Amino acid sequence: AFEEAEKNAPAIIFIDELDAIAPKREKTHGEVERRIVSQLLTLMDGLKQRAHVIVMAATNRPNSIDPALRRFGRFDREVDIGIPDATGRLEILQIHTKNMKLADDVDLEQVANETHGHVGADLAALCSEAALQAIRKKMDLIDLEDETIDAEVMNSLAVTMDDFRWALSQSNPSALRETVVEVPQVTWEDIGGLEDVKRELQELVQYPVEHPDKFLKFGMTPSKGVLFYGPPGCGKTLLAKAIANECQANFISIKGPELLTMWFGESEANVREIFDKARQAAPCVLFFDQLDSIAKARGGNIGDGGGAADRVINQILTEMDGMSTKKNVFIIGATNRPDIIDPAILRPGRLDQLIYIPLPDEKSRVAILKANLRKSPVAKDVDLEFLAKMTNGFSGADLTEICQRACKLAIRESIESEIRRERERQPVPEIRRDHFEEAMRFARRSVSD
Amino acid sequence: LSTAILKQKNRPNRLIVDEAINEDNSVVSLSQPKMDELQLFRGDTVLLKGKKRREAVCIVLSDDTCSDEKIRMNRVVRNNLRVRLGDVISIQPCPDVKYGKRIHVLPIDDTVEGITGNLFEVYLKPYFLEAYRPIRKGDIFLVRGGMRAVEFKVVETDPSPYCIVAPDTVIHCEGEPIKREDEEESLNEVGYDDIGGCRKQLAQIKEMVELPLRHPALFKEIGVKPPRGILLYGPPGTGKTLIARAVANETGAFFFLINGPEIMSKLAGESESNLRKAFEEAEKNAPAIIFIDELDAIAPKREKTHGEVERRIVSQLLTLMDGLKQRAHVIVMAATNRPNSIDPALRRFGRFDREVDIGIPDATGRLEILQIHTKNMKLADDVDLEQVANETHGHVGADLAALCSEAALQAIRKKMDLIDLEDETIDAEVMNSLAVTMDDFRWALSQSNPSALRETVVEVPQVTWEDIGGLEDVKRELQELVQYPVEHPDKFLKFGMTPSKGVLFYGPPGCGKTLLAKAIANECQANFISIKGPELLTMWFGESEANVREIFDKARQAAPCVLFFDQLDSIAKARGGNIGDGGGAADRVINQILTEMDGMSTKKNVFIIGATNRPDIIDPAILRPGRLDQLIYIPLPDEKSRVAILKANLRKSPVAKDVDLEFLAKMTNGFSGADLTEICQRACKLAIRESIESEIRRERERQPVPEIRRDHFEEAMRFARRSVSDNDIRKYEMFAQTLQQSRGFGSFRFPS
Amino acid sequence: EIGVKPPRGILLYGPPGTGKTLIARAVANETGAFFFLINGPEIMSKLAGESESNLRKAFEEAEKNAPAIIFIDELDAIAPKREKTHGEVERRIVSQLLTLMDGLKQRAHVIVMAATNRPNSIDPALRRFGRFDREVDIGIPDATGRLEILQIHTKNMKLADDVDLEQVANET
Amino acid sequence: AFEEAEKNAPAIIFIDELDAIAPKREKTHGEVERRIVSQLLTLMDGLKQRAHVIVMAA
Numbered sequence A: 001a002f003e004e005a006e007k008n009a010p011a012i013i014f015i016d017e018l019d020a021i022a023p024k025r026e027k028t029h030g031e032v033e034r035r036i037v038s039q040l041l042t043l044m045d046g047l048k049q050r051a052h053v054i055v056m057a058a059t060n061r062p063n064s065i066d067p068a069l070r071r072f073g074r075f076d077r078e079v080d081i082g083i084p085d086a087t088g089r090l091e092i093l094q095i096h097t098k099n100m101k102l103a104d105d106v107d108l109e110q111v112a113n114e115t116h117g118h119v120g121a122d123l124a125a126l127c128s129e130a131a132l133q134a135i136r137k138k139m140d141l142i143d144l145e146d147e148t149i150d151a152e153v154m155n156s157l158a159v160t161m162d163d164f165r166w167a168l169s170q171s172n173p174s175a176l177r178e179t180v181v182e183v184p185q186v187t188w189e190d191i192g193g194l195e196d197v198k199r200e201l202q203e204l205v206q207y208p209v210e211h212p213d214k215f216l217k218f219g220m221t222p223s224k225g226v227l228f229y230g231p232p233g234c235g236k237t238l239l240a241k242a243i244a245n246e247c248q249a250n251f252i253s254i255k256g257p258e259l260l261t262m263w264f265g266e267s268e269a270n271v272r273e274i275f276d277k278a279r280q281a282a283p284c285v286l287f288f289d290q291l292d293s294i295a296k297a298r299g300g301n302i303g304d305g306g307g308a309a310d311r312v313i314n315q316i317l318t319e320m321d322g323m324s325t326k327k328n329v330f331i332i333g334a335t336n337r338p339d340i341i342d343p344a345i346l347r348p349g350r351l352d353q354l355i356y357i358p359l360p361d362e363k364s365r366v367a368i369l370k371a372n373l374r375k376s377p378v379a380k381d382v383d384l385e386f387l388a389k390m391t392n393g394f395s396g397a398d399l400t401e402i403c404q405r406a407c408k409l410a411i412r413e414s415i416e417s418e419i420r421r422e423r424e425r426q427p428v429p430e431i432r433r434d435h436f437e438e439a440m441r442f443a444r445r446s447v448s449d
Numbered sequence B: 001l002s003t004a005i006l007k008q009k010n011r012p013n014r015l016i017v018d019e020a021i022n023e024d025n026s027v028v029s030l031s032q033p034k035m036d037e038l039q040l041f042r043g044d045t046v047l048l049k050g051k052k053r054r055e056a057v058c059i060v061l062s063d064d065t066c067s068d069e070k071i072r073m074n075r076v077v078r079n080n081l082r083v084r085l086g087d088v089i090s091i092q093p094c095p096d097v098k099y100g101k102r103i104h105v106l107p108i109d110d111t112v113e114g115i116t117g118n119l120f121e122v123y124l125k126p127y128f129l130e131a132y133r134p135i136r137k138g139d140i141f142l143v144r145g146g147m148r149a150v151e152f153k154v155v156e157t158d159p160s161p162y163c164i165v166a167p168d169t170v171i172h173c174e175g176e177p178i179k180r181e182d183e184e185e186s187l188n189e190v191g192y193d194d195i196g197g198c199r200k201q202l203a204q205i206k207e208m209v210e211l212p213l214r215h216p217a218l219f220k221e222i223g224v225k226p227p228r229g230i231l232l233y234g235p236p237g238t239g240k241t242l243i244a245r246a247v248a249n250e251t252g253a254f255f256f257l258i259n260g261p262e263i264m265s266k267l268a269g270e271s272e273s274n275l276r277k278a279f280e281e282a283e284k285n286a287p288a289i290i291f292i293d294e295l296d297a298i299a300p301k302r303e304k305t306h307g308e309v310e311r312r313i314v315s316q317l318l319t320l321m322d323g324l325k326q327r328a329h330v331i332v333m334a335a336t337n338r339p340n341s342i343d344p345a346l347r348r349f350g351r352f353d354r355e356v357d358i359g360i361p362d363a364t365g366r367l368e369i370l371q372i373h374t375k376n377m378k379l380a381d382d383v384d385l386e387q388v389a390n391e392t393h394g395h396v397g398a399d400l401a402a403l404c405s406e407a408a409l410q411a412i413r414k415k416m417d418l419i420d421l422e423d424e425t426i427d428a429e430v431m432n433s434l435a436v437t438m439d440d441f442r443w444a445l446s447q448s449n450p451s452a453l454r455e456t457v458v459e460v461p462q463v464t465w466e467d468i469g470g471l472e473d474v475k476r477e478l479q480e481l482v483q484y485p486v487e488h489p490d491k492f493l494k495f496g497m498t499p500s501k502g503v504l505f506y507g508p509p510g511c512g513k514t515l516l517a518k519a520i521a522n523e524c525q526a527n528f529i530s531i532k533g534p535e536l537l538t539m540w541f542g543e544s545e546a547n548v549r550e551i552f553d554k555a556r557q558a559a560p561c562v563l564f565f566d567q568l569d570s571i572a573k574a575r576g577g578n579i580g581d582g583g584g585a586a587d588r589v590i591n592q593i594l595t596e597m598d599g600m601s602t603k604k605n606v607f608i609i610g611a612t613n614r615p616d617i618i619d620p621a622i623l624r625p626g627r628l629d630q631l632i633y634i635p636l637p638d639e640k641s642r643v644a645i646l647k648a649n650l651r652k653s654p655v656a657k658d659v660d661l662e663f664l665a666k667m668t669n670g671f672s673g674a675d676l677t678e679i680c681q682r683a684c685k686l687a688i689r690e691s692i693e694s695e696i697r698r699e700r701e702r703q704p705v706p707e708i709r710r711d712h713f714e715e716a717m718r719f720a721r722r723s724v725s726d727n728d729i730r731k732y733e734m735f736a737q738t739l740q741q742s743r744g745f746g747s748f749r750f751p752s
Numbered sequence C: 001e002i003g004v005k006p007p008r009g010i011l012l013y014g015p016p017g018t019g020k021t022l023i024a025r026a027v028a029n030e031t032g033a034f035f036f037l038i039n040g041p042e043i044m045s046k047l048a049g050e051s052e053s054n055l056r057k058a059f060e061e062a063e064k065n066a067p068a069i070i071f072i073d074e075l076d077a078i079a080p081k082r083e084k085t086h087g088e089v090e091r092r093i094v095s096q097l098l099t100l101m102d103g104l105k106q107r108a109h110v111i112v113m114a115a116t117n118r119p120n121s122i123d124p125a126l127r128r129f130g131r132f133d134r135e136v137d138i139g140i141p142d143a144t145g146r147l148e149i150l151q152i153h154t155k156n157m158k159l160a161d162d163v164d165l166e167q168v169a170n171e172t
Numbered sequence D: 001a002f003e004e005a006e007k008n009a010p011a012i013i014f015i016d017e018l019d020a021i022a023p024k025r026e027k028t029h030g031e032v033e034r035r036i037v038s039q040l041l042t043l044m045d046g047l048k049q050r051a052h053v054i055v056m057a058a
């Protein structure tokens, strides 16, 4: 290959998937692979003397390459093809939409702004999905078992902004296909109370991404971490669900102990990969449910899993300190017992913002009851204000249990009624006071003094 | 719009298959108005489209009895088109058909036997004399005559593929007879109609696979290229390979099948060479479809792979699917159980740009699967497939196929007595009487169990609701806990509230917490997983939380599923209480459960039930509503419950009528359920000892006790003891006292 | 006539010495079909792709001589769970077994048998319908079963009239 | 080893440190050890073929 390049000069050699034939020689068990790496080093050394030959290489694992291949004279120049910003996304969309016939309705600027973590392959997939949605819209007129398509259908075929909106709804970056989870649809209106907490959350995410330069002008850096601590059932996870749906950023949700692995070095690699995954999709929200599982006080016991429990938290601190400035990764940790959280996790520069989600007061409990019953048919005589004052120490989940218990009693009454109606052959339009009254007697308080 | 590609269309060509009273193999019958709408003259040559890319040519006939929207066609043409009664076919006139110069035909081997005379002269010559019968390549037809009827298959047509068998055409039956097994296998091919419960997934796959091939001008007009990579993932047995076979059988494109491990080779660079050769052969025959079954076998993460050969294979696949030289009209499909094990670079636009989740079907989906699997099966009139679909809850298509096979085998077992295995042949009357009844399906349901659940299966001792005495409110709540969300999901949507799926049992030992769990495993119509406390814990740094993650994922696939944690206080204790718990492994298990019961994921019909002797040590987060929101206290039985417990234990036992169970409950005050059972078991032992002594005495003279009497119960009562002390009761009552005192307000009443 | 395809996968599980291998040998002897015996560790090799090639060779030998019966003894060692196994070769062996037993090309006339002591150690995808649909539990015999086992093992031995095998069966 | 012993029949197969070579499959986590144990079980089952060789272990 190198000789053919030298014979026809000037020449370009493109080695695609370089890491396939350029692993680290120390890590390589095979003899042929090591001989190939050494041959590549020799070929590059002779290439420096060779006339007008350029070697280009592409790889998505630059760290896997042998370090000697990245010295001076061998691949000395490295170009980072990163994730595009809004204007780059607009350019990619314009490139991929030039051959596609679009209606005047479509606005590529909105689509460019709404795809936060896309790399360009994701944008091409979005365009293809929008065109396929248009074809689906015409699939009512034209069916698959047809000999030909009418020319009127061909002329009427076009891609509108609605198809692009559908594609955006289905759109997700390919980086985050491993981390995607099915999150319930939770609007900010589903959360009752916590009005000040909602305002703090929206400003802590929107301001750093929307207006970076003002922080530079005022000589201050935005906080990159928020800790949710409070009694169980008061809405720490529910706030994360609302952010995942309503906040205009990518979301990565992490179950606490899912990162840890029995194999040596795998637990720290998973932490390193998950932070790198969020950085590729910035602005991204990295959420740790039950943070005390991974972020626990070091030195709790000698009999650790080979010390791996203490290494993972060290890797987390290393990852948080590495990321800063233009990278926009908000790390949100929800902890149920914040006292067992390791203090280094809460120090300035790492999750320094601490938000307390308390037991709802009387006014909040009215909002919680209204939010749970917003979609539910309830009798007007039911006084939710009265329930709030009698449910003195009830949490958000305690109040939701009351509503669910009242629903079940209403369901129970209707079922015995439909059984009775079938019997006389051979009701319960809404939840009433008595259903709430009987449900209130089973009600308990879960958070104690 | 998602399933629009599936939706059928009513057209002048589109009519329904119906039987032919007298039409023979080479003609079809149509109503006169339908022919007039199509403007076809009687006797004209027509081309009939069939499923799995099959075609047949016939002579159209006008009959009054034929339905306007139907074709009267016999069994032969139906077997030619691989259709059945009630199926939709399209009819199109054959343009520029010409008489065949020469036609080559090969009869079936099972038919040619027993016929000493020449096949051609006896059958083909009169069948094709002055008839001008049209034939197509690969068609099979029946000619009556001789000792045995002989079926002929037209291997070759000249001119291909439409030709008319005129008397001048030379017909020769020389050659290898066609195997019966080959014809049977060709008839029993998987199509898109053999997949049920995956309607949206089938629509997607058809959009990527069939739509670009059928109407390439559409994508050319709209100026985009369709997706070229499909990844099918799901739990085992959901039908990914079945969809692959259906796509292979029903596509006009060239299909290349790659199995995962078969790529590997001992020689260096030969596995990459195999991948390159497969892709090059696919490109040579474009348009083409490549299926890589078990993709996770040869496509792991390169960052996590130790072997160099595996990483080089993944890199070769990456280059072939999206490299400097782009694919030319090649579709690449793959099926995997674990999509997350696939290399991330393989999951993006240009390489498997669409991921299709073949998930667990719902009740209607599994009803569709049962209808698919029972079409060839002979069923009685009492068989109700809707009921069977309702009983199966976490079953996938493989499980339903297993259920149907078990039902048929049970029918064969019922007819085992009449037949003899040593006998060479079975009686014809037994063959005719053979039919699967609803009883066989009920027995198969009894033996049925979802395949995902075969590790987590335990032998329950078959406890009925009537085996438990007292606890009437708890029985009613537990029955409504599972029945309401699964049998009445419409009621919950009407009130717009999520069902409660958590129950905790706590109380003194021996009062019925495990007995209630046994009853649920038998009586409730849902899947059941029984977990001992410390069985999930493992020495390794990750398995302890991984086992918790796996068991909840297993319950989500089998929903509605009841997840019973016996001795919950072992698994879920207070976090941070004790140091030296395997380096915090015990606390991490608790944190894992917290996310599984309530976290950043949608809720399924998984009902977590826990029984604990010590609820004071259980983590408060575990008891939070949304995780075991209903705490049910199971106390020591009162006097009314104690007669019920005594009656339940002695229900199947012969007891003298003079024994007064009312007095036994009056005397015992602090006895638990296990204490009352111990009194009855002691009475049996004394009765057994008495009977043994009677027969031993009866034997000595050579060289009784028909029922348990009062003197047995009186002697058994002097050894009786009260297992739960008054000190222990106060601890359980205190927990109940605190919960009741927590709410306050006494009895809640609305004003006015 | 009943219109179903008979099951073609059998898994025998039980404590060691229960008689799984003996039952396999008896089935081999008295069935009158091609019998191919596979032992778990024997298929496996160090060279890449050799274990899978051995599996294909065995299954295609059975396919050539259809109807055929394949017995895989000690299935637990050959096929551990792929999620819990770190090595690539074991995972590819399990995947090859899955593909051979149930794939896009079905096997019509071949029945596959397997024996293991720990059924839960098997990869779950093997235990579904179509690969190992029925799991037969060879368990510890009762008094009459061990009586007839004693009669089987005592048919060649010279026994005096003093010997009573029912008592011996009751003692064990 | 078993093949050479059977060729040199009659012979005695002696396996020093049997415990290291063949531990409990459930107890051991390493795949290779249970692999060796299963192979050893198969070899012993096949040994009783009138090969006149007796296997012994320390």
Ligand SMILES: Nc1ncnc2c1ncn2[C@@H]1O[C@H](COP(=O)(O)OP(=O)(O)OP(=O)(O)O)[C@@H](O)[C@H]1O
Binding pocket: A190, A191, A192, A193, A194, A231, A232, A233, A234, A235, A236, A237, A238, A239, A334, A335, A336, A357, A367, A368, A371, A372, A395, A396, A397, A398, A400, B594, B598, B599, B621, B624, B626
């Ligand atoms: N302010 C609120 N408004 C509406 N619903 C609420 C509110 N607070 C709690 N809930 C409801 O109660 C439950 C709270 O569960 P959530 O996951 O939010 O708890 P958490 O505060 O994160 O606690 P945990 O430590 O137990 O995980 C949910 O069912 C939620 O719908």
Ligand SMILES: Nc1ncnc2c1ncn2[C@@H]1O[C@H](COP(=O)(O)OP(=O)(O)OP(=O)(O)O)[C@@H](O)[C@H]1O
Binding pocket: B194, B195, B196, B197, B198, B235, B236, B237, B238, B239, B240, B241, B242, B243, B335, B336, B337, B369, B372, B396, B397, B398, B399, B401, C098, C102, C103, C125, C130
């Ligand atoms: N949706 C379905 N409709 C009809 N039959 C189905 C369906 N799903 C599964 N089956 C049947 O159950 C079996 C499924 O086997 P198949 O090879 O398709 O499974 P799979 O999902 O590819 O499994 P694995 O992940 O182990 O490879 C076949 O017998 C098939 O006929």
Ligand SMILES: Nc1ncnc2c1ncn2[C@@H]1O[C@H](COP(=O)(O)OP(=O)(O)OP(=O)(O)O)[C@@H](O)[C@H]1O
Binding pocket: B467, B468, B469, B470, B471, B508, B509, B510, B511, B512, B513, B514, B515, B516, B611, B612, B613, B644, B645, B648, B672, B673, B674, B675, B677
């Ligand atoms: N309500 C009851 N009706 C009938 N039998 C009962 C009842 N409660 C307990 N028993 C008897 O108690 C014995 C087993 O009790 P069970 O296993 O249900 O106790 P448990 O509450 O789970 O206690 P433990 O804390 O000891 O596990 C059986 O003999 C059963 O018949």
Ligand SMILES: Nc1ncnc2c1ncn2[C@@H]1O[C@H](COP(=O)(O)OP(=O)(O)O)[C@@H](O)[C@H]1O
Binding pocket: C015, C016, C017, C018, C019, C020, C021, C022, C023, C149, C152, C153, D045
């Ligand atoms: N059910 C049985 N009936 C008669 N003999 C048996 C039975 N089970 C085991 N054996 C005896 O055990 C020996 C074979 O055991 P084997 O089946 O190889 O054990 P495993 O099932 O662990 O492979 C034979 O010599 C046979 O005599």
Ligand SMILES: [Mg+2]
Binding pocket: A236, A237, A289, A334, B598, B599
């Ligand atoms: Mg939470």
Ligand SMILES: [Mg+2]
Binding pocket: B240, B241, B242, B293, B335, C102, C103
């Ligand atoms: Mg498959």
Ligand SMILES: [Mg+2]
Binding pocket: B513, B514, B566, B611
């Ligand atoms: Mg118990």
